[PDB]
Amino acid sequence: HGYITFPIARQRRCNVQGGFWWPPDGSGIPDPMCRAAYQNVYNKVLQQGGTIDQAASAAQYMFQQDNEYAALAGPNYLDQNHIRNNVVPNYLCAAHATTWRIRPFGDKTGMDVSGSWTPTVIPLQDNTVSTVPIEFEFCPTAIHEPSFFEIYITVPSFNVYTDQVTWQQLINIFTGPIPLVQRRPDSQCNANNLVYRTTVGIPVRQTQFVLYVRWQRNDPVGEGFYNCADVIFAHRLGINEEDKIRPPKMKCKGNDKDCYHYHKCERQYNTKDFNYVEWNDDYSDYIENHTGINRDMCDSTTKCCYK
Amino acid sequence: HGYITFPIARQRRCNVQGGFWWPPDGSGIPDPMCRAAYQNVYNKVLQQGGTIDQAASAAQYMFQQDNEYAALAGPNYLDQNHIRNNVVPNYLCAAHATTWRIRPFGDKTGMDVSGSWTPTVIPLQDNTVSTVPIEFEFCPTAIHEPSFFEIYITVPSFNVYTDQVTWQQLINIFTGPIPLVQRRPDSQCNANNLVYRTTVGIPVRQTQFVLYVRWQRNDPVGEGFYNCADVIFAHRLGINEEDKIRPPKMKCKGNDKDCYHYHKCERQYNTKDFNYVEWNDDYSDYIENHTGINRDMCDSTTKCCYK
Ligand SMILES: [Cu+2]
Ligand SMILES: [Cu+2]
Ligand SMILES: [Cu+2]
Numbered sequence: 001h002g003y004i005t006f007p008i009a010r011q012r013r014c015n016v017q018g019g020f021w022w023p024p025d026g027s028g029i030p031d032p033m034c035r036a037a038y039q040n041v042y043n044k045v046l047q048q049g050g051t052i053d054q055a056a057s058a059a060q061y062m063f064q065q066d067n068e069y070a071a072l073a074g075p076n077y078l079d080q081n082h083i084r085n086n087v088v089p090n091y092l093c094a095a096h097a098t099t100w101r102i103r104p105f106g107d108k109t110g111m112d113v114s115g116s117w118t119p120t121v122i123p124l125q126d127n128t129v130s131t132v133p134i135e136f137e138f139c140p141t142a143i144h145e146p147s148f149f150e151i152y153i154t155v156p157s158f159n160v161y162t163d164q165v166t167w168q169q170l171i172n173i174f175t176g177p178i179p180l181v182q183r184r185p186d187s188q189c190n191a192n193n194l195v196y197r198t199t200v201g202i203p204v205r206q207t208q209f210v211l212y213v214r215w216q217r218n219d220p221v222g223e224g225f226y227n228c229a230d231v232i233f234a235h236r237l238g239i240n241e242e243d244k245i246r247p248p249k250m251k252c253k254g255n256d257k258d259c260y261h262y263h264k265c266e267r268q269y270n271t272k273d274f275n276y277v278e279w280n281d282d283y284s285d286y287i288e289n290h291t292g293i294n295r296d297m298c299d300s301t302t303k304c305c306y307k
Numbered sequence: 308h309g310y311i312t313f314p315i316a317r318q319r320r321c322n323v324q325g326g327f328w329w330p331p332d333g334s335g336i337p338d339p340m341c342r343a344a345y346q347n348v349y350n351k352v353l354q355q356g357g358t359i360d361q362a363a364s365a366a367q368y369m370f371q372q373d374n375e376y377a378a379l380a381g382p383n384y385l386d387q388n389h390i391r392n393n394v395v396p397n398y399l400c401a402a403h404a405t406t407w408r409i410r411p412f413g414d415k416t417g418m419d420v421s422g423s424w425t426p427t428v429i430p431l432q433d434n435t436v437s438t439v440p441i442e443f444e445f446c447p448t449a450i451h452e453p454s455f456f457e458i459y460i461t462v463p464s465f466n467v468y469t470d471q472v473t474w475q476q477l478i479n480i481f482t483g484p485i486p487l488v489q490r491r492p493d494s495q496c497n498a499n500n501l502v503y504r505t506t507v508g509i510p511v512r513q514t515q516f517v518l519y520v521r522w523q524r525n526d527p528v529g530e531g532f533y534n535c536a537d538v539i540f541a542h543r544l545g546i547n548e549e550d551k552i553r554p555p556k557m558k559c560k561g562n563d564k565d566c567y568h569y570h571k572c573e574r575q576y577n578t579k580d581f582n583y584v585e586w587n588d589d590y591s592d593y594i595e596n597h598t599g600i601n602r603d604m605c606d607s608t609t610k611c612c613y614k
């Protein structure tokens with residue numbers, strides 16, 4: 001049993017943020033996607049004749065069981081067609097848990113809804129880099145060996161706002177065993193002394209993307225843990241350095257001088273010759289009145305009457 | 308002569324925002340990309356032996372001449388290979404003005420640097436829409452007819468932070484004459500009573516993109532105006548509606564009630580069971596210490612000495 005602590009898995013973040021224990025309808029969950037996830041399972045059970053308690057039980061079970069986003073593969077766990085067609089054919093972020101009445105693995109399908117899932121924001125120091133090394137940290141709440149990991153990235157055409165994660169959309173970037181190592185004092189995992197850590201060069205994405213992590217046990221039961229991790233690269237601001245023309249080393253003079261281990265934690269855009277704040281509020285109204293299917297076309301200039 | 312007023316052209320926004328008249332080194336320009344653009348031309352002239360005045364003249368000429376981002380095609384203006392190989396082969400956002408000593412069209416190459424160019428933010432009401440209708444508004448400061456427009460969009464693999472705009476990266480979405488119409492009272496153009504307005508269904512992009520607008524005169528001189536427009540679609544937040552399970556219509560009772568024409572202009576994420584602000588500041592440090600080429604690997608746990 002376990003989950004991704006870095007980059008934090010989708011269900012791990014929903015669990016740690018809380019607000020899901022009470023009120024039972026999940027209205028106390030601050031993150032909107034964690035809330036939708038919860039309320040989808042809650043409303044599903046309500047539709048299927050479950051009581052408020054069975055509905056709040058099924059939804060809280062999805063959040064609480066963040067170390068058990070699992071599926072059993074059996075002894076045939078290396079058979080890729082059996083994983084993709086039988087073990088986890090769909091509901092990948094839920095590790096294919098679709099039955100609220102049956103535990104394990106209950107119903108975790110709420111974790112597969114699409115929308116503005118909160119990502120791990122990784123900043124870019126150079127916007128031209130092809131890959132970004134990420135040191136993954138998988139938190140084992142229960143120690144299991146022998147085992148192996150599989151790390152996937154979504155294809156560049158994936159859209160987290162509208163799409164469900166599918167195998168046809170995932171690119172394998174890591175396959176193999178990850179040895180168990182002692183957690184660092186700064187570890188995001190607080191279960192036991194051990195973690196799984198590995199460095200993966202993550203292909204740079206210009207959009208929010210998903211990292212798929214499968215932790216598979218090499219054993220006849222074939223239990224595997226499947227977790228989705230929402231990530232985004234933040235671009236560096238300013239000119240791309242490779243285009244920056246630097247001035248020659250110069251020494252100037254004249255009566256007018258304007259002629260020549262801790263870090264830091266819109267009226268700035270106004271100048272003496274332009275009021276940006278006023279213009280940009282009018283420019284925002286322009287965007288609203290002149291974009292979309294309901295934009296102004298003729299009504300502001302055309303009058304009509306029935307003959 | 309003219310420029311795009313909606314979505315505002317890259318050079319039009321740099322001109323209207325000001326701060327470029329004084330100090331002459333462009334240090335008074337608030338937008339970082341408008342500043343880099345200016346300072347690239349200023350530093351180019353300085354490198355080529357120009358004085359501070361010739362350098363400040365060439366850079367201010369680029370900003371001031373926002374209605375003259377032009378190139379002459381001659382009588383062969385419908386010959387696409389002649390436009391792309393002879394008239395505007397490169398420096399597309401500058402309309403191929405590369406000579407600071409020669410006016411027209413001077414040097415406007417600063418407008419073709421890559422980086423965090425400020426876009427026109429168009430919000431999405433539905434993240435599943437394929438196209439967004441935009442009502443373009445081209446501001447003619449000088450009236451010319453006969454003429455035609457060409458509107459292009461960058462391919463989805465374009466990256467404004469690193470790439471120069473090329474014809475091999477542009478997709479034609481509009482070709483033809485746009486009739487001259489009376490400006491609306493809310494017009495972004497303040498030159499004369501007339502504007503060019505057209506509706507284009509803009510293919511949705513998940514990234515910041517460029518809109519290329521060519522205004523070509525049908526005449527033996529063959530003067531055309533070429534402008535880049537930086538745009539981005541803002542995604543709607545929350546669950547994708549097509550995945551939202553709604554509860555059945557219910558009427559509940561019990562002693563515990565928690566069991567059941569003008570618009571509006573992080574401690575919110577904390578709950579009674581979790582302190583988000585503290586966790587997320589530690590999570591930010593984790594990202595910094597465990598991503599990139601300088602991440603912590605062995606130094607926090609390994610000690611060495613020279614035998
Ligand atoms: Cu286990
Ligand atoms: Cu420092
Ligand atoms: Cu003109």
Ligand SMILES: [Cu+2]
Binds near residue numbers: 568569570
């Ligand atoms: Cu309203």
